[PDB]
Point group: C5
Chain length 384, copies 5
């Protein structure tokens, strides 16, 4: 006349101790099977070398104290028991560095032969060793080691619920619209021993993830291209205009402030720097070379009033690779000498300015070729 569930709960949970490992022969370990499904990757901190994920975790073990015959209890083959009323193994990850706030599941399933099932979502704060050598295109290899913190392998052994193929090829619920992309989850069993007669069992899950580089394209490639374009645009100013130096120094200031602003989002580890810093400093070196060429050309064509005539070797190479009446007379001769001195100085300045113009055009063509070579090399290395 009982509801056939109160009867079973009173038959099971009475005279039951939740501190004893549920075995009738203490020489047998409780094999705890484990299954893990990745759901989301909340935050990957490259500075502190931590990893915040969120998984759906579930275990199975045999409780030799929760067993009954269904025909006695109205063919009841399973029921739900509160989690704080039975023995639960202490399986937790070795690579913890904090505690994740996870919802509390208060019930567990129990079958008529002792098979307990415990579904529980977990938020993991794992200390992973991150390598950012190829920053925009890197494949991180983090590990999760499920082990019993106190019991040896003669008490709790850890197996896998599903086959390793199904665990590796499972992306059914992963939030894929984020920054990271899940490649696989590779499980592996290992008997880790600290001493003799003290061997622990553990199950390592290798979470292999890959970053999406288009998150940083608009933030890394656009300003450099824009600055190189405005540089090759400003390279067409006349060298004697007195504004090319200001243009180049303002451009270098802008590139410097952009570099020191974007260096914050760029991660950094104490072991090494990403390979993009080399390309950034190569671009800034190209800008500095452009500035130095501008300064040299300005130093050439400047009218300093100390200019001597251009040497003949340089001329060849560059410009082929490109009485009262007597008193009146002497006064007029002095005036003509003054005017001729002025005209000769102007002609020397003109010759120097033409030489400078030719050299500037040559160096501009060389710089353009070098920039195009560097750009096509970068494009090929991106496209391979």
């Amino acid at each position: 006349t009982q509801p056939a569930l109160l009867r079973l709960s009173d038959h099971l949970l009475a005279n039951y101790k939740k501190g004893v490992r549920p075995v009738r022969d203490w020489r047998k370990p409780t094999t705890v099977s484990i299954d893990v499904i990745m759901y989301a990757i909340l935050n990957v901190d490259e500075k502190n070398q931590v990893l915040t994920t969120y998984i759906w975790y579930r275990q199975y073990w045999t409780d030799e104290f929760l067993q009954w015959t269904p025909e006695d209890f109205d063919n009841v083959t399973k029921l739900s028991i509160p989690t704080d009323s039975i023995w639960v193994p202490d399986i937790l990850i070795n690579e913890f560095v904090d505690v994740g706030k996870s919802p509390n599941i208060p019930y567990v399933y129990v079958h008529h032969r002792g098979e307990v099932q415990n579904y529980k979502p977990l938020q993991l704060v794992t200390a992973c060793s991150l390598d950012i050598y190829n920053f925009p295109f890197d494949v991180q290899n983090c590990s999760l080691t499920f082990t019993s913190w106190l019991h040896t392998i003669q008490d709790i052994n850890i197996t896998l619920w599903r086959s390793p193929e199904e665990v590796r090829s499972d992306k059914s619920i992963f939030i894929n619209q984020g920054e990271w992309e899940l490649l696989e989850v590779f499980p592996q069993f290992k008997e880790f021993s600290i001493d003799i007669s003290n061997s622990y069992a553990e199950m390592k899950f290798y979470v292999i993830i890959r970053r999406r580089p288009l998150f940083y394209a608009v933030s890394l490639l656009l300003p450099s291209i824009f600055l190189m374009v405005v540089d090759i645009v400003g390279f067409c100013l006349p060298p004697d205009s007195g504004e090319r130096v200001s243009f180049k120094i303002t451009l270098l200031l802008g590139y410097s402030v952009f570099l020191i602003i974007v260096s914050d989002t760029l991660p950094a580890t104490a072991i090494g720097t990403p390979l993009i810093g080399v390309y950034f400093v190569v671009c800034m070196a190209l800008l500095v070379i452009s500035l130095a060429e501008t300064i040299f050309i300005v130093r050439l064509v400047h009218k300093q009033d100390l200019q001597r005539p251009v040497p003949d070797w340089l001329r060849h190479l560059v410009l082929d690779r490109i009485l009262a009446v007597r008193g009146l007379l002497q006064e007029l001769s002095s005036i003509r000498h003054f005017l001729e001195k002025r005209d000769e100085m102007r002609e020397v300045a003109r010759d120097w300015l033409r030489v400078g113009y030719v050299l500037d055009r040559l160096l501009f063509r060389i710089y353009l070729l070098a920039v195009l070579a560097y750009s096509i090399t970068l494009v090929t290395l991106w496209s391979i």
Copy 2:
């Protein structure tokens, strides 16, 4: 002589087990009805793809162990029972990524036929997939899936307390002065099965929200308009003044620093970039074209002392589309030749400067027409 409430509490909560599903026949599921009301949208994080809301949640189910006759207990038809004294279903959202700090409601209502009522406010930290293609005007479509985490559909089935129309058209308490605007909450029932004989029941609520674009108008449209205005103002400087290049390069530096400052508040997802980046780079391309035109006009009108007379075709097109006495004599002739050379060089420079002025006016008119076309196109696309 008892207070008629102590009697009922002792009659109900004695011999009561809070771990057993309250059914007299285990072949019947406990239908849990659900009602949800949105109250506030605390934070929408487009970077980590999370959503923090705050709802008012309430459920109803039938407890076949809490039943009495009112006439026996002084016509008491309902009372309040502590929540930790009865069976509560484990209904929680599938899309959790954290735990929200919510107040604890310690009591529940119970009627004389078993109908339990459980009001409880919840703070949800939900992993939603956000699409920001149309950033200032986007309609996000997030989902909340209420399901039983352990019980199958033969134990706990989920229904709706109100009709779907009332759930869709309910905005009675929503905090509307924020950044997001609630459009509707659309419920839908689905029997989600992982395997055969293992089918779970769930209730999906589609929270459809829309961002208010005036939050970002004063921060996105004002600086671009101001910079375009000062650009068309500075376009009136004389090209031979030697300050137009400095003006344009300072303006481009200011636009660049504004761009890299405002790019932080602009969100970004690893799948795509918003459509406002295209308009921003089009504006910066217009600025770069203005700079290039200024540089070209400066290169034309510069007095380089190497200037040859302007060709006749260009002239036509542009400027129509717009003895002691003999010794004294030869000395005076040399002086006159010097002066005539100077005057001829000045005249050539004047002709080139006039050609440059005409071309500058033409290109300024063209640039103004292009800017007005782009502005009216943007205004129409905003106003449609």
Copy 3:
């Protein structure tokens, strides 16, 4: 021979149920009186529309199960009982969006007729609708609604312990050295009904606060005044010096970077923008007008070698509102003609420069008058 307190505790807390509403007749509600005192305003977030306060809260109700005669228990008229041993009503605020960490008070006072007293400090995280139209001088009007989350008005009714005058005029412990100033706390009772036969009681407290504007004076008024001063200082540079344009563009760049830096501390709501943005854009428009006037005056006085003589109407208005011997002869005449051409061009340039100087002085006086008018209008609007 007992300590006369153990006796009373055993007489009261034995056969006592902490889940039953303490009434002998279930047709009577437990009138819970409420008193609230503001202590501090921790943080007002205008972006997320939340409000973090800290109050001293206390309630009073009648427990008909905790009653005794003092003469029996050695004239004991009151004692302290742990809070987890009696019935406590579930009074909490409707406008919660989080949980505040508040100290736990473990004891309550009980008198010999059932009057229980429960002092408890609370930290509130309340969702308030903030209006920042007059940002530096605004009077926020936030609300706190104390209501029973589950019980109707036939079970728990809410009254006020003190008179509304004393609750409105109480600032005894408020931390007044902060940014916000408390004006009053106005209570109001309302019977809020969702349906028929389901009416809830609630008590609304309107916390009316006012911001102190001197917190932002040194951060908002000082840079604008400094920039206007340096602008009217730089307005005295000669227009033909070739540095006035650089001065004005550097000043505009500085004002722009200051604007985009201070726009972060300036709050913003999706419904509207504060009225200070209008004054800021008016100041930046004044700066842009100064830049345009400088550009115009520079365009006037520039020596372009294309300058024609100033028209007579403009002149009037502005400048009144302010043989071998024959061969020698012809050679000397040609020289004199060259010199006369140069002198005539210089004279035309001088006339244009004088006209430009006069117009610059006139426009500078006009701009100074306009700036003084705008400043005195702002001062009057602040002082009223």
Copy 4:
């Protein structure tokens, strides 16, 4: 035959009620002695007016229900009892605004006459009123008020364990390498009464701390000195070089960006601003005066072709405080007149430039004297 500790624990904790104030005569209060030792000052927030400290707190009271004779229990004079098994007073600070995460001490000492001892470390989040008028050198005066939150003075009275001298002169464990320096902790007892017959006891501890100014020397004094030095360096540029104005405006831009960058680390309260802002605006006013002097000197020495001869009073003061033959003849006379006009204009320009040079040297000496006076005044005010 018992371990002589199980016996005593069963003799004490049996028939013991942890909710009753441990007195045999309810007309006697439980005098709780208090001792406090500062350990660290974690964070002082001048914006929100909070203070986060960490103290070592300990109390002593007499429990008249925990008493025994040592000779009966094998000369046991003291033992440890779990804290959740006895009565603990509710002593907490009045100035709380949050809850501090502190370790939990599970045991307390009890002597054979009832003296209980309760050591416990506490993290305090206290609302302190901060005065930052003298920001780099300020002595904050914060208060901690230990009082019983519910019990009046007839139930719990608060005394001091050590003498006030030892509490004032105790710096044994204070972390001294931080930013703040502890001066003293001054205790004071006060009987605070809200009404008649309702008087509470409290113990106020005045934590008097002092900031170390060398934390901000390298961040406040270095850039101002550097900018003043580069200003007095750039003051030596020739006034007619056309670069002094650019130098001064770039320097003012740099000082402005430094000011608006360092104004963030500078705290600010709604009641007043620190006294360092006055010195900062005095320095910026000196820079603006230098800019105005440069502009004036530039306006003096500029060659505008409108220059009239320098007036004689200014000259005195400044420069003492520092036929075919007839046709040929008339043509030569016209040429000589042109040349003489040019030479006269050049001579007038030279005179004006010399006057400007003299005035510039005089004003530079005056500015240097003023800067040295201001610097020595600041040094003396720092050194007193």
Copy 5:
């Protein structure tokens, strides 16, 4: 017929008190052995002087109430007991300033002679005194003091489980890819006494860590080298070009903004500043000296029309260490005098410009030598 584990649990945990120190003779202390292994260093905050680590902690003590004979209980020599069922000592660190979220280990091992084992991971928030005098290369010396917070040395004494050599030379699990490198963990025992007859036992662990300097190389050495390079590049501009001053002032502005940007990542303590600030201000002083030299050379070579001939001593040193006919006649003489005056002024300007060029080359060579000396000194101090 019992499972031989339920029997042992009922034999042990029945009649067991978890509040009594497990000794049969109260005159014997419970020697608690301790072992500590560092696992990760999460965050070192130099501003607030805190240290966040994560260790693997384990203790051992003898429980004289948990003892049995294996042959009686089926040769069971050990089992797991819940932690909340036995007596656990209150060993915690003295240098706490917060509470670290650590996983909860619910079981402990117990042998058949009372040896209990308690493994537990801990997250420590320790107040450490940090010295950053040699910021990029510093060896921090932090301390962890494990002591019993309440029990004296006659109740709980603390020993070491492993030998001090094994504790010092253990780096088996340390996360080494981070910013800090673990050198050793040196334990030391000390009997700390506050009074007479009140002596406590404690165990100090000196965690000695060292920072990796390559984390800050790319952020500290690169911009300074780049700016020095562009400075020595710009040092080649002609001094009379009128752009060298603009170049130098723009470079100084860039260096200043870089300095004030990187000064944030540079830590700072109230006791002293790191030694890198001296080198940074030496570099900025070199830049200021370059600016002053540029200003001096510009002041020398400027054509001011007030230039007097260069003195002979300076010349030697520098330039060796490097009637109608009569009317026509007088008119021609006046013209020649004008031209000769102009030519003489030009010649004086040329002489001054040559002197300035020579001095500029000399000072540039001196500055280059000084820069190379400073760079090689820095390189040697880094390489030693």
